[PDB]
């Protein structure tokens, strides 16, 4: 179709429309005190919200050249959230700052590569200075004590996640499933988690988690690709007969296979998920043979003269849950023998030694810490199904926290990080090389106290003076917009990962770069 | 679709004129001389009515802005009234005089989340004054005052009401069957009701009551999900050739099975109603089994070695009526018989010694009352069945009235009540943190006169001048709007029960408190 | 011709949008950092200014409704101004922030009239308070301190100041007029002021200093109405003829005498003038004695047998020069000699004791110090007369500041005074009878803090954390708009008078005051 084609300024400022729109919605919602967004809902009373993932999720312009800032802004901040399980609101607020503030310049007639080039070094030195900054968190009672902060003032959520962390380890897996009883319980079941996702978001069916959850199903594998229907049509059938989802582990699946599974699953005909196998080249078959033999399944291939057209229940491996995520895909108690695993897991860690290189080494170690590790199931327990589903989030969110803060330790939350971060990296040493990078350095600087200004603003206060008075003390001291109070941010139990805030800084400064260095903009004619 | 976003006073507005025009419709049917509403019906005459909760429900803006505020306003009032079983027109008039006032604040600068905090200190005060000012009401003499108060001083409900409730108990199941002669009647019939509702509004058949009530249904149990429609097709059959009508407990129903099952009901191919099992976890067997034994039916499950593809109408319990709520679902004159059912009352209260936690042990006693109390049947006697429609309408409201007013004892009504609770709480001493907060506390402390002066404007006396003479009076000194008489209200029979005051200012206090507080909008453009 | 009315906010709001207009231009022009203000001018180039007096007066509407409060609020600044030589821009923006501050809680339907009587509280309080933070300067060397730091760190004109009024007194009287040599000069020379102004603005010859002057002109005194021209046109001719200029001295003029004299002035027939004799009662003919023996003329009264007619310019009086201000005329160097002067100061001085009552007697003592005081003058001295003219402007606002300062002290100035004042008041105790009262106290509170806020604002600093820090501060310490700096303001010499900071407070209360009890306002129909 026809195209509408705009240059410079009179693009820059749409996307900075769309970028603003977006985030005046996004920022009222960040802090402990953050205000309320109405969303409507198609029919049925309006929801209400206090999270900036909803109020972001739910924000589209009518406009399409702002709705290209409006997207943008709203992938770089999903990319910042499900790595970190939080920040998505303050890494929208961070990039409306760090425009806000780089059109002011461009205007000026600065060099837009320049002030990218110094936005870059400002943050790169922020990030190097957060490194020190950060309070590391490695000891059970750290965990418990982050998991217990994370989950409101929860002690039994803390100490679950910091019992199901120390023993599977701080790479483990960790899945939360609905208890049988007042008190949480955990447990390590045979399973492993790979980084591959559903192949269609219609595959989810639990929209509050956005992901693919499937109970007791049947686990398909295959090594070769799928795109008849017909090549698997006999073993569907037997699925539907047999009543129990289906889990498919293919090298892909498309065309008029992958539309009947979307079909399927939409009518309820049946209900399947499809993953691309995970690794490539002979990793591909390993994989596929560890996942067969810990779901005690057998992997169809034509090496081993099997064929998809005459496959069995039999041949298909089956566990208690599999969950589908966007980018990882985790089995929960595969059928797998405990005996033939632990006889793989001693072939994997001898043929470490076989390795002919390092990368092959860190590959087999890498198999058997996923196999050997299993997966731990936190029953989360509570005395209602209301009950339950609040609690369930709450143990998720601290799980993520937790993972997230043991990576890169835990940093005074509420805005004051980054302040911190910005002192230690000015009294450090930071210059441009020209006046230029130097107006990109500044733009930075004045951009990270943006979210404590919100923070503070959302509070009630008046940003100005309680950012000059966190700025007037030193460490860890900084404001707590709950209490309205001065003090140490960490003692009060006020926390932020590391890597939400870094990923947060950083994702918001690419795209800050991306919509300053923009000069030209194609949308669709009305 | 296309988003439209408003922010700050430009949103706050639109809600205020969506609350207002809800609550000046609704506030017209309130108070013993409310004044007529005409509503438009697609057919036929116009309906006039003079009750809150039908002019609330027909309300839906054309703005979707304005609609925001109506639908959850509408929304916190249908939950003031479906725990109370009225006060949903004071709800509206307090949530609409609260943010009417709120709204002057905010517009003067003053801090909306310190205007919340005020408003909830002051709601909690006046809610604990009223737990002083409420008289009880346990005595049988007493319950059937309040009955036949609530009645329109009919004594044969009050007495009928009294004597259902004394025998069953204050927590009793209590319902209403058109009765086999002029005199009302009541019985004891086998029968539970759990806090299940209809998975669909499609299943109701009754819109004048909003319920589901079928009669002589089978009973279909099952622990495990149902998604497939095949699952449950030949026993569907053969209850369709049956001809008696279908109640499906199970874990879940969805998709195919629950959409066949709609379309079904609303076609007229069968009478059928789909509700979740109570309970969960291991309580969720104990339930099914007890459901099962009350109705006469078998569980249908793998561990019990049956399977609903093989299911037969002799498996499937039945009872004389089942009614299904919102809420909750009842079960009238179940099949079984009444020697196992005590035999299981038995094992159930010698299981109570078994309990491991004073968690299991309560619920063992929630089993053992929901079993062996029964379900209390009125069966209410008039002339004709346009009397018949009329007295069991108003049995049905005496009940829920004195059902509010056991738990909570009665006061004052008219509007007298919060005046009171208002006077004993700044008596008390009642005070804000901040100017801030005291503007809130002034807030509450003007909008819970509110009822009374629309009560007068209907009447149509001058609000000021009765507001003024009731607050010089003491106790239960009141205005009568129905004879325009001062005195005890009480005597006069003017009551509402404690439950209905306290839920309408707290769930107003909660609208208002949402919509002082929001300060971002999201809405379909047009 | 027809009229417009406006009712409540309708009104209200207009005033408001006059006020704020006007009060935006006046208050860029606040502060040492203060911005410049371009002004239209007839013809040639537009003239830019950076003073409150200039822009204010070329100020004026075009919707009738806002000039109303525009001219309002002008006209008590100039009251203010006036009275005490500066503050015009204070006023403005200390009644800008509190009606802008009062509609807020007007609109929010508190009490107007308890604002108001609020609003008077507060500022009784503040100014009850600076009473006491105020540094008197009654010593020479703090008169020439006070009078050199007014001159922008001009000793010399200090100097001058001090020596004029430590000979003369403190209520004497002291002019200024330029000098004969490089080095200022001052002289005591016969002469009197007093409180009458000029009849009509179009006496005015000198718009830079909006008073009339004339040089060696004949004083006419007269005791009796002049309104036929007749009357006097013998005695003008004779003048006329004379050359000299004309100051007439009468109980009024009035009529066609007054539009002739104006007329002449206008065209340049004759330098004219024409003021109210002082007094009035048996004080008008002592005034007019003291006065005709001053100049060394007789007054013109049938009771000493002269006629208008028939006066010739012997009988007239004459001085070197006559300055006649709006409020008040001063004649300097009256032709009376030194002899007949003291022979009736000694007269005045024994009728004293011969006074019945004790305002008889502070009567004779005021024409004892107005004649036998006599007139200071000060002979400006400087290389040029582009240096005069700019000499001349600093030396008359450093004595009317100084006149200023001697009467009520000093205080620091730059905005930190109110702040000073309203802690001290807030720490005595300041408290509303009703919450209207305390809204109203609220206001005054919040607004004091307005000029040091624009000062900032206009540095260019953030308002916000600069009055944060000057409130953390005691007694003098405050902030330096001129270097940004902080401390003593009074060892920097930033200094207001005690009377220009409490004149602009009061009248800008007055103002917010009769703005925010307005309820109705009629203008001319377009």
Redo the contacts between chains.
Sequence with gaps: AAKEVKFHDSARERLVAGVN?LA??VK?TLGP?G??????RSF???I?TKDGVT?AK?????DKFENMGAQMVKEVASKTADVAGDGTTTATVLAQAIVREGMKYVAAGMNPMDLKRGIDKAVTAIVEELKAISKPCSTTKEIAQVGTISANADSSIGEIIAQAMDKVGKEGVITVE?????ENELEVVEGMQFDRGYLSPYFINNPDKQVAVL?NPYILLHDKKISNIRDLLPVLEQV?KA?RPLLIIAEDVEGEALATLVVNNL???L?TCAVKAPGFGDRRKAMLQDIAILTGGTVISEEVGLSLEKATLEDLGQAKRVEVAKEHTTIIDGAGDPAKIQARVKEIRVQIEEATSDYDREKLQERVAKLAGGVAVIKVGA???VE?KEKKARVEDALHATRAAVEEGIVPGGGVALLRAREAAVAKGLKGDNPDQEAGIKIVLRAVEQPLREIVAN??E?P??IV?KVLEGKGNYGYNAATGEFGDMIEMGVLDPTKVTRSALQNAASVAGLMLTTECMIAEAP
Tied chains: 1, 2, 3.
């Design positions: 729109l005046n919605a009222t005190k205000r309320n967004v109405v969303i409507e049925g009373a309006p209400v109020v739910e924000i589209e312009l009518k609905d208890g049988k009883s007042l109970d539907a009543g009518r309820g005909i209900k005395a209602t199904e339950m509070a009630g008046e100005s003076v000059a």
